[PDB]
Design a binder for these strands. Sequence first.
DNA 1: TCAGGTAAGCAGTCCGCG
DNA 2: GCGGACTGCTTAC
Length: 903
Amino acid sequence: MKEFYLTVEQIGDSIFERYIDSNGRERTREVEYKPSLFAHCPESQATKYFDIYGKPCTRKLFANMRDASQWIKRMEDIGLEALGMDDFKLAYLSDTYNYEIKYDHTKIRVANFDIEVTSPDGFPEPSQAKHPIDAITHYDSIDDRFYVFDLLNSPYGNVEEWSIEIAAKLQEQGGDEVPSEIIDKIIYMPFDNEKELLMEYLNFWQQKTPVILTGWNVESFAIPYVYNRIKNIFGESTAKRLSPHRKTRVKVIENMYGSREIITLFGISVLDYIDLYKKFSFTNQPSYSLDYISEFELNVGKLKYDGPISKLRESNHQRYISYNIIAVYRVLQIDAKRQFINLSLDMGYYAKIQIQSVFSPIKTWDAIIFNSLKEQNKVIPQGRSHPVQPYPGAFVKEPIPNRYKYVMSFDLTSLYPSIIRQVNISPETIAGTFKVAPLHDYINAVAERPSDVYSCSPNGMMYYKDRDGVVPTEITKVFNQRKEHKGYMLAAQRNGEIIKEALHNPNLSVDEPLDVDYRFDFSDEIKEKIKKLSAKSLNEMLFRAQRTEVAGMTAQINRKLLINSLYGALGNVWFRYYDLRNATAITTFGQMALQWIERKVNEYLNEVCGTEGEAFVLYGDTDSIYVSADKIIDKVGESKFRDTNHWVDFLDKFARERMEPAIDRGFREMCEYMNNKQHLMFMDREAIAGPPLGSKGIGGFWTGKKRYALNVWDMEGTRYAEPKLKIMGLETQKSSTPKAVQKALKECIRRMLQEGEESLQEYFKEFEKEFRQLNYISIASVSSANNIAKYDVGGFPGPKCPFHIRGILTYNRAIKGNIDAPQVVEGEKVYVLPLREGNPFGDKCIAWPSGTEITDLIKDDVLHWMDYTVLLEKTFIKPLEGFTSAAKLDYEKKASLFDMFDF
DNA sequence: TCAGGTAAGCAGTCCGCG
DNA sequence: GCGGACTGCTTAC
Ligand SMILES: Nc1ccn([C@H]2C[C@H](O)[C@@H](COP(=O)(O)OP(=O)(O)OP(=O)(O)O)O2)c(=O)n1
Ligand SMILES: [Ca+2]
Ligand SMILES: [Ca+2]
Ligand SMILES: [Ca+2]
């Protein structure tokens, strides 16, 4: 097999590399790698190395890496550019793996672990590590085993051995319900003392050294705690055995309002799953506790126990250990679904970077571009210092707040990367500038043609057309990969809808789910078999289709993220190819493209309807347009349609056969106007929206920019079994909005769009009547909480104190003195409730850590003093009044002359 | 919230507005 | 009471 790296490090003048050799074996080597850097040289000097601008360079080979770094410094002192890859391990990988890396994941040791630490005096700080580690569960992907290290004797209590028999039993048998599928995979090791536990853990670690190290909060808690605890007990040298090269470094991670410490383990790639989740999941969660996320992702029950976690080991060690094991499994289950590890490996090996560098698109793209240029013997420029500067972005059209009955939307495929490719935007393709006219002049095609030679953007930039830049070349490769995975995603989505339809008529039979590949549209044979299946088999197939869709989503959306982040990197001061001329070229072209096509669509539809100056495009944001289809529907007549699906088909056909060709023609003209390299503005129909045929539903509404709701029947070629609400920006979509309120507001919207005013009025009346019965957590608001200290003046709100921070200070006074009470963590999230006047907390609101029950110290008082009236007005009534005013509807029935008769 | 970008909405504070 | 200036936080893209 072809060799591939696992980890790479620079330690002084040596590269330390762990790798899989040609025989499939894990090896480690130390290489005295001699790096090369570059200086510009005279034209008369014969060379094969040239910078990206075509200027000749001489290669300087250094005796070692320290010499190379010192040379860079001296070049700065002289005031001359030091060219080449300054990150020497990236150069090492480029030299050592000069081919497309094909990795075998089965050879890569992926470890995920979780530790338990009993602490009687609050949160056990990892920098201190003053409390015993009393449990470690460490899953190894190669062994497929959960290694459980269990401390039986502690200063906080001596306990009996954990029982695998009880662990396996149902909660109703007094067991822990450790999933049956992992029971036989548990290797249980009890220890009579913490020293022997940790020494064995280290010996185990040496034998089975993680390449990828993951878990939940492992980088912020588990790793630093383990390292510091071992350091405290045994000394530094023993703790450093967590590194296969015995090198570690305390790394200070800085943010806007403070800093924290992590431990860098040389020769390991830490991919903390919480951070993978935050980057790649495209959620914003009210809480990032493993419990909360596992419930959200897997629909698994909350892990229940009596009393505080500080007393769990002493009171129920059985449950304590089982829950430690389950926590490790839940991360594996989340990854089985989301597949962020697979994604990270894919990206890392493609770029030829340390796998952990996938968190940095700047590092990822620097490596991709370097490898690409190196292939042509080209030499990368030196990174430079730049001051942070604001620059303009997208255009968003101001909509007229209103109901909109029939809507067709259109969207440009991968806009910013498509602009990069079309215009040929790259550091080395800059041709010069032209004299800019107001943007409106380009939008209306009245400005003079920018260039007859170069490819242009309306920000004044011109680009070479003779050959693709490295940025267009490399962005295209990843775009093409994204397209493939999106194809799989949409097929699985369409397949899911086929199964949902079949579930209306399930067969009374006992059978199996079909063995199919959900990434491809079901054949006629498969569809016929599906119509004969039981509900049990169909539901299993639906679950599998949805899992395939999720797998495709991860793969496609994050390749989309990577390519959009290349645009983003052009506007980031730390990128080697940072250039606001290029960043603004992209965004300004986008603004023109959107408003150009708005004009073209308006012109086309005014022509086909026989009107003048009427606005068919009701809204647009960045790269999308929303087109009113009322007049199209009205031209055929609503009475001519058999059912909802009939007018959906009609609009589908109209968009594809009439509108899309018109849009294409408009963009081809724009391409010629800007003299671009390649026409790549592909705007396809996205959503078809409207009320159910014969209903009093309003179909859709806009309240303002980035705030709308649509009843969608077809999305990107997926015809839904049931209409799906597309709600953007509204309170239903905000993590700050209470859970039960999101639900209620969503039902209000559903009724507005599908059923009408009277239906909405009936639901509002009921929610207002019953909402005080809702669980307090479900009606609590949520907010991130920063700068708590800034607004804390003697435990009381300082000037301009934010409402949620006021809540935290109220909480802090109420739990004052309690060492065991849950602390609000700076930078994390809190639940927030309003309090009625005259309450014992002495203020108008209280806040507590999100994803948790408020401490029993104050729970009863919070419940008693919760201001339901304020809660309802702020979170529910005010947003609903916004929706209904925009939609021109009333959520409460107005008095009429009919009131009253009957006698 | 260490780790690509901008536009833009709403909650809330402060306080003017005769 | 509502809006403007401002901070904070959250979305859409
Ligand atoms: N996280 C994001 C999302 C969007 N944008 C920019 C780049 C996108 O090209 C443009 C439009 O965003 P879309 O959500 O419509 O995504 P794309 O057009 O890139 O991809 P596609 O529509 O094919 O899914 O906005 C961005 O810079 N970063
Ligand atoms: Ca798009
Ligand atoms: Ca059937
Ligand atoms: Ca879009």
